[PDB]
Design a protein around this ligand. Structure first.
Ligand SMILES: O=C(O)C1Cc2ccccc2C1
Ligand SMILES: [Ca+2]
Ligand code: NA
Ligand code: NA
Length: 225
């Protein structure tokens, strides 16, 4: 099945990504607080709803929040400033708070129910966001021997997410706070602050995409160049 691409709002970042965030893939962004990772998540939750000539997939979004980062009024602002109705856009982002890592796993199973329900409608789910994907796992699995257990549980969670991406042709977008641990996202992107309020993006361990860094801004439209 054809891979779909969701624009980030930034031509620069889209170019680095090969056209946008991909369906049938998990894209992980990681960086410090304020590096742009959560702003990008909010922007994508709007962009996915646009028709494809505007960089979207005529879809809806689901957002799993682990550390209370979701801001409905930020979605509304981004929508309004892109010419969209803020309430309709907000209504197309299904939201759930994950209370702990086990609940987070259950939420992925519930996400599948909604994805199945909407799959063949005029507005299928096309984006699943997990913000700070590792936060509960790092809180709960800690101490002697916790590395193997935590990594096994994360690997399983990520396998579940890969399955949804592949089976239902959706983009999975995950964020993490910031060197020898294994990772299993399809594509990893490091974000950092740069000069002039810009953020800088770099692909990590991706020899299949060309060399470079993207530069973008955080604005009233979410993310843009
Ligand atoms: O069906 C629901 O009400 C909730 C299930 C779920 C799972 C992940 C993200 C959002 C939501 C919404
Ligand atoms: Ca951010
Ligand atoms: Na995949
Ligand atoms: Na709707």
């Amino acid at each position: 099945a054809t891979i779909g691409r969701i624009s980030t709002g930034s031509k620069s970042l889209d170019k680095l990504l090969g056209g946008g965030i991909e369906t049938q893939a998990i894209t992980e962004v990681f960086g410090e607080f304020g590096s742009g990772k959560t702003q990008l998540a909010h922007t994508l939750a709007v962009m996915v709803q646009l028709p494809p000539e505007e960089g979207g997939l005529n879809g809806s979004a689901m957002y799993i929040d682990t550390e209370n980062t979701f801001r409905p009024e930020r979605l509304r602002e981004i929508a309004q400033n892109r010419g969209l109705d803020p309430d309709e856009v907000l209504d197309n982002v299904a939201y759930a708070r994950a209370f702990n890592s086990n609940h987070q796993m259950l939420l992925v199973q519930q996400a599948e129910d909604m994805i199945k329900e909407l799959l063949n409608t005029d507005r299928p789910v096309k984006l699943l966001i997990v913000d700070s994907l590792t936060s509960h796992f790092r809180s709960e699995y800690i101490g002697r021997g916790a590395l193997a257990e935590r990594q096994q549980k994360l690997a399983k969670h990520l396998a579940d997410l890969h399955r949804l991406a592949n089976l239902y042709d959706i983009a999975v977008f995950v964020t993490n706070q910031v060197h020898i641990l294994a990772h299993s996202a399809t594509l990893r992107v490091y974000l950092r602050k740069g000069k002039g309020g810009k953020r800088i993006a770099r692909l990590i361990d991706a020899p299949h995409l060309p060399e470079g860094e993207a530069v973008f801004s955080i604005t009233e439209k979410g993310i843009e160049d």
